[PDB]
Design a protein around this ligand. Structure first.
Ligand code: HEM
Ligand SMILES: CC1(C)C[C@H]2C=C(C(=O)O)[C@@H]3COC(=O)[C@]4(CO4)[C@]23C1
Length: 397
């Protein structure tokens, strides 16, 4: 008997670590070590989906002497209103209540139109340039930051100011850098709130300022805007990179999609399901048990940490036949867990799907000879950032 320790090694640049798949073959739940507390690791689709819907399993830590966390994880939990287990029910309910109507069908319809034109322009610029080109910098990075500028109602050049702040805030390796970056986010957002109070527009902070006849404080409003800024582009960038790499790996699927862009929605769902990078520490949703929960044979006790492996679950053969295969022709595939499930189900997921669909409708049609200009093995998943990701994707075309 050898206690497994997260994170597990992955000899590939994508996919699930072999040891996590081995645990998943054994059963749905295993006790593992981490860099901090030991935790229950749940790796099968059915059990992860069930626990994501279990109101006893929450983000906030109920423990009296809570384990220490990196500055990055503390900021992420506070942005998600999970920093105080006694106030999480009301604060999280208000958070979702205030954020969900900012992504209305009216707004998403307008943004889809703008996103499509912007991808067209981004790809014209790419196709006219001289290889090798960093696809990450000129495509993956540019579309989601454009979108966040649209949501916040700021000039597009602002993303050159804030484009690295998600990475810096969520740098688990440097508490000083994390804290200094977050202060920059706070300073910027407070500037923006004060501007929108006298110069509002069709944007998210203006709507919050107007909300409940102005009942929200500027600190409340900036807090929600920080969540939009820090959650609203970085993970989407990562999915554009992973989707590009996955399609480059599967030429038959890529050719199907180039021929029929109507397969883009199905490709986007396969990209989300299979898009896991490096050791995939970001494909785990963390929780604490606020009450005892039984998982098959295993009792999770109040206070226990739980890692719900949405990545592993999305690869689960029990839920997806040939779960490791990229397949554009899956008949009625189960809903993947890449946006989570239940109480904290991703608020931006419809917008994120709009962005990924617009890209992969166009990418291999516009650049039919696109391919990596370096070996895959030279691509470097950034394990120290909560959101992982590659720093560059050199391509030719
Ligand atoms: C492909 C891109 C994205 C992925 C893979 C993703 C993934 C996720 C996941 C797994 C969660 C659940 C976390 C948990 O259960 O604790 C989540 C929550 C959240 N996401 Fe997304 N997300 C994406 C894009 C976005 C975008 C574009 C926005 C906003 C513009 C956004 C806003 C949020 C917010 C505010 C939450 C917190 C929900 C809550 O705690 O109630 N996300 N995201
Ligand atoms: C709010 C989040 C940015 C969304 C989720 C997706 C992530 C990711 O794709 O990197 C983040 C990684 O860290 C987490 O705890 C997550 C899995 O919940 C995320 C928090």
């Amino acid at each position: 008997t050898d206690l497994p320790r997260l994170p597990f090694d992955n000899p590939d640049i994508m996919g699930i670590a072999p040891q996590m798949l081995a645990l998943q073959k054994e059963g749905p739940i295993a006790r593992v070590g981490t860099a901090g507390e030991d935790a229950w690791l749940v790796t099968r689709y059915d059990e992860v989906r069930t626990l994501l819907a279990d109101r006893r399993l929450r983000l906030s830590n109920p423990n009296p002497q809570p384990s220490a966390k990196s500055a990055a994880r503390a900021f992420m939990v506070a942005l998600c209103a999970g920093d105080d287990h006694e106030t999480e029910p009301a604060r999280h309910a208000q958070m979702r209540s205030l954020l969900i109507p900012r992504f209305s069908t009216r707004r998403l319809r307008l943004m889809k139109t703008r996103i499509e034109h912007h991808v067209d322009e981004l790809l014209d610029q790419l196709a006219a340039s001289a290889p090798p080109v960093d696809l990450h910098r000129v495509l993956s990075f540019r579309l989601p930051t454009m979108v966040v500028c649209d949501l916040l109602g700021v000039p597009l050049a602002d993303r050159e100011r804030f484009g690295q702040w998600a990475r810096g805030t969520f740098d688990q390796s440097d508490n000083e850098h994390s804290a200094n970056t977050f202060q920059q986010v706070v300073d910027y957002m407070l500037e923006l709130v004060a501007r929108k109070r006298v110069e509002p527009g069709d944007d998210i902070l203006s709507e919050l300022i107007a909300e409940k006849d102005g009942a929200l404080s500027d600190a409340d409003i900036a807090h929600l805007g920080n969540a939009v800024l820090l959650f609203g582009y970085e993970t989407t960038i990562v999915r554009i990179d992973l989707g590009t790499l996955l399609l480059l790996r599967n030429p038959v699927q890529r050719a199907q999609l180039a021929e029929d862009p109507g397969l883009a929605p199905a490709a986007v769902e396969e990209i989300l399901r299979l898009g896991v990078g490096g050791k995939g520490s970001n494909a785990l949703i963390p929780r604490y048990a606020h009450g005892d929960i039984t998982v098959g044979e295993t009792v999770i006790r109040t206070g226990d940490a739980v890692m719900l492996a949405i990545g592993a679950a999305n690869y689960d053969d029990r839920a997806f036949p040939d779960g490791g295969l990229f397949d554009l022709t899956r008949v009625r595939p189960r809903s993947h867990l890449a946006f989570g499930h239940g109480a904290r189900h991703c608020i931006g997921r419809t917008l994120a799907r709009i962005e990924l669909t617009a890209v992969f409708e166009r990418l291999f049609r516009r650049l039919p000879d696109l391919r990596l200009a370096v070996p895959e093995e030279s691509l470097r998943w950034q394990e120290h950032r909560i959101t992982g990701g590659f720093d560059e994707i050199p391509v030719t075309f």
